[PDB]
Enzyme design. Structure first.
Site, PDB file in Angstrom:
ATOM      1  N   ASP A  35      58.765   7.943  16.158  1.00  0.00           N
ATOM      2  CA  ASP A  35      59.463   6.905  16.997  1.00  0.00           C
ATOM      3  C   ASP A  35      60.869   7.251  17.347  1.00  0.00           C
ATOM      4  OD1 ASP A  35      60.080   4.416  18.087  1.00  0.00           O
ATOM      5  OD2 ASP A  35      60.459   3.558  16.085  1.00  0.00           O
ATOM      6  N   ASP A 218      61.297   5.797  24.535  1.00  0.00           N
ATOM      7  CA  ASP A 218      61.029   5.402  23.480  1.00  0.00           C
ATOM      8  C   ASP A 218      59.479   5.711  23.002  1.00  0.00           C
ATOM      9  OD1 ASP A 218      60.133   3.593  21.134  1.00  0.00           O
ATOM     10  OD2 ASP A 218      61.550   2.020  21.937  1.00  0.00           O
TER      11      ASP A 218
HETATM   12  C1  LIG Z   1      67.342  -1.253  15.588  1.00  0.00           C
HETATM   13  C2  LIG Z   1      66.106  -0.945  15.835  1.00  0.00           C
HETATM   14  F1  LIG Z   1      65.196  -1.155  14.683  1.00  0.00           F
HETATM   15  F2  LIG Z   1      66.091   0.591  16.048  1.00  0.00           F
HETATM   16  C3  LIG Z   1      65.283  -1.325  17.108  1.00  0.00           C
HETATM   17  C4  LIG Z   1      65.288  -2.786  17.255  1.00  0.00           C
HETATM   18  C5  LIG Z   1      64.551  -3.424  18.229  1.00  0.00           C
HETATM   19  C6  LIG Z   1      63.963  -2.431  19.210  1.00  0.00           C
HETATM   20  C7  LIG Z   1      64.234  -0.980  19.310  1.00  0.00           C
HETATM   21  C8  LIG Z   1      63.611  -0.309  20.278  1.00  0.00           C
HETATM   22  N1  LIG Z   1      62.574   0.775  19.710  1.00  0.00           N
HETATM   23  C9  LIG Z   1      61.224  -0.184  19.165  1.00  0.00           C
HETATM   24  C10 LIG Z   1      60.306  -0.763  20.389  1.00  0.00           C
HETATM   25  S1  LIG Z   1      59.118  -2.006  19.777  1.00  0.00           S
HETATM   26  O1  LIG Z   1      58.097  -2.052  20.601  1.00  0.00           O
HETATM   27  O2  LIG Z   1      59.522  -2.693  18.779  1.00  0.00           O
HETATM   28  C11 LIG Z   1      58.085  -0.542  18.670  1.00  0.00           C
HETATM   29  C12 LIG Z   1      59.037  -0.031  17.877  1.00  0.00           C
HETATM   30  C13 LIG Z   1      58.243   0.850  16.675  1.00  0.00           C
HETATM   31  C14 LIG Z   1      56.854   0.358  16.202  1.00  0.00           C
HETATM   32  C15 LIG Z   1      57.148  -0.847  15.238  1.00  0.00           C
HETATM   33  C16 LIG Z   1      55.933  -1.472  14.931  1.00  0.00           C
HETATM   34  F3  LIG Z   1      56.018  -2.653  14.104  1.00  0.00           F
HETATM   35  C17 LIG Z   1      54.836  -1.093  15.137  1.00  0.00           C
HETATM   36  N2  LIG Z   1      53.614  -1.841  14.918  1.00  0.00           N
HETATM   37  C18 LIG Z   1      54.564   0.123  15.981  1.00  0.00           C
HETATM   38 BR1  LIG Z   1      52.922   0.911  16.764  1.00  0.00          BR
HETATM   39  C19 LIG Z   1      55.903   0.622  16.486  1.00  0.00           C
HETATM   40  C20 LIG Z   1      60.285   0.873  18.216  1.00  0.00           C
HETATM   41  O3  LIG Z   1      61.415   1.160  17.372  1.00  0.00           O
HETATM   42  C21 LIG Z   1      64.651  -0.540  18.061  1.00  0.00           C
END
Ligand SMILES: CC(F)(F)c1cccc(CN[C@H]2CS(=O)(=O)C[C@@H](Cc3cc(F)c(N)c(Br)c3)[C@@H]2O)c1
Length: 375
Positions: A35, A218
């Site tokens: 990620d 991302d």
């Molecule tokens: C501060 C932080 F944690 F880095 C943060 C908080 C909100 C958005 C982001 C941006 N990146 C996010 C975008 S997202 O759609 O939520 C998926 C997430 C990773 C993720 C979490 C999950 F649950 C599941 N199933 C899956 Br597949 C993948 C990313 O990491 C980063």
């Protein structure tokens, strides 16, 4: 060796791509989501209906409890855990073992996915967005500090899993030129989009609109996500282009299937999307071109398998532009942390048909000297 690291990823755009890792002594093998959109390394550490296995700290003699807790809310999904450190390795990655922070997940809500085949997440972005705060050193930073591995990695994500190459560029994984865009700020992998075209037609917005809030790369997000204004313009253009076809209620909201007879998907009525990224030289840019084979995501379901069915993998964002997995797929993407830049090239698994192909092309020059960054 890079050759040993090729094809070390499995998984999907929709449920993410994962790499095998080990934690603890003796090593406990887990599959871990890669990620680039977050900065915490976290693993399931207690039983859960959707976990095939989990980190058992009591069986690791090298585990150290930091006696502190951590909570991480993503856009969707969240988990809570206990922080510690332990020894971590990537069997099909670099030939090293390092000590790293690990969040042991003890409670979670809509984080783990039923059938995904991964048990944790590897946040590859910068400390600035680590939880609880930036004092928690991310895995890749620990890896670079404790080993001689060069400060960069690359991702080759492939659709219907790919390669994560740590420590250098594998020229075997791409053809043509590698084009670089600056990392605007080291928190997310933030970049700047300077121009957007849909089937060759400029959207003609002030370019700051393309980066409203921010634009990031991302790998943990499936879709291309766009700010409201840009999203609406994109849907308008794609709807006009595909007007000879009738689409189900809700299709453009991204949660409704459209299907065609096996092999008959009308790719040609859907436009290509070109995202022009800021270049390394003032007012030069390059474009990556995205085909419908990318932004119409195939949904594999045995029950629907008489036909080919897809979801619309472009969505409206409240968090800025997100170049997610369906955008990265088919490109070789180099996260050159050492030089604060991200590179794009066409990879061996790039999408194409007999008429059109994904591409990375440049340079393009722009007259207007406006800074397209929103902040
Ligand atoms: C501060 C932080 F944690 F880095 C943060 C908080 C909100 C958005 C982001 C941006 N990146 C996010 C975008 S997202 O759609 O939520 C998926 C997430 C990773 C993720 C979490 C999950 F649950 C599941 N199933 C899956 Br597949 C993948 C990313 O990491 C980063």
């Amino acid at each position: 060796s890079f050759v040993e690291m090729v094809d070390n990823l499995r998984g999907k755009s929709g449920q993410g791509y994962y790499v095998e890792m080990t934690v603890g002594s003796p090593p406990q093998t887990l599959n871990i989501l890669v990620d680039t959109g977050s900065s915490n390394f976290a693993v399931g550490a207690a039983p859960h209906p959707f976990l095939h296995r989990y980190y058992q700290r009591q069986l690791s003699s090298t585990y150290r409890d930091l006696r502190k807790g951590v909570y991480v809310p993503y856009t969707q999904g969240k988990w809570e855990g206990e922080l510690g450190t332990d020894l971590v390795s990537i069997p099909h990655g670099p030939n090293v073992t390092v000590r790293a922070n690990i969040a042991a997940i003890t409670e979670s809500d809509k984080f783990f996915i039923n059938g995904s085949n991964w048990e944790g997440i590897l946040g590859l972005a910068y400390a600035e967005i680590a939880r609880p705060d930036d004092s928690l050193e991310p895995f890749f930073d620990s890896l670079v500090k404790q080993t001689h591995v060069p400060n960069l990695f690359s991702l080759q994500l492939c659709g219907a899993g790919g390669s994560m190459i740590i420590g250098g560029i594998d020229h075997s994984l791409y053809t043509g030129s590698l084009w670089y865009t600056p990392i605007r700020r080291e928190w997310y992998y933030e970049v700047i989009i300077v121009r957007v075209e849909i089937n060759g037609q400029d959207l003609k917005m002030d370019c700051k609109e393309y980066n409203y809030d921010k634009s990031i790369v991302d790998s943990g997000t499936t879709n291309l996500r766009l700010p409201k204004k840009v999203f609406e313009a994109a849907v308008k253009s794609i709807k006009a282009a595909s007007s000879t076809e009738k689409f189900p209620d809700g299709f453009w909201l991204g949660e409704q299937l459209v299907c065609w007879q096996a092999g008959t998907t009308p790719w040609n009525i859907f436009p290509v999307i070109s995202l022009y990224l800021m270049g390394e030289v003032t007012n030069q840019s390059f474009r990556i071109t995205i085909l419908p084979q990318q932004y119409l995501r195939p949904v594999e379901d045995v029950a629907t398998s008489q036909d080919d069915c897809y979801k619309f993998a472009i969505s409206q964002s409240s968090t800025g532009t997100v170049m997610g997995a369906v955008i990265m797929e088919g490109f070789y993407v180099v996260f050159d942390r050492a030089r604060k830049r991200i590179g794009f090239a066409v990879s061996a698994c790039h999408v194409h048909d007999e008429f059109r192909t994904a591409a990375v092309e440049g340079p393009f020059v722009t007259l207007d000297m406006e800074d397209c960054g929103y902040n």
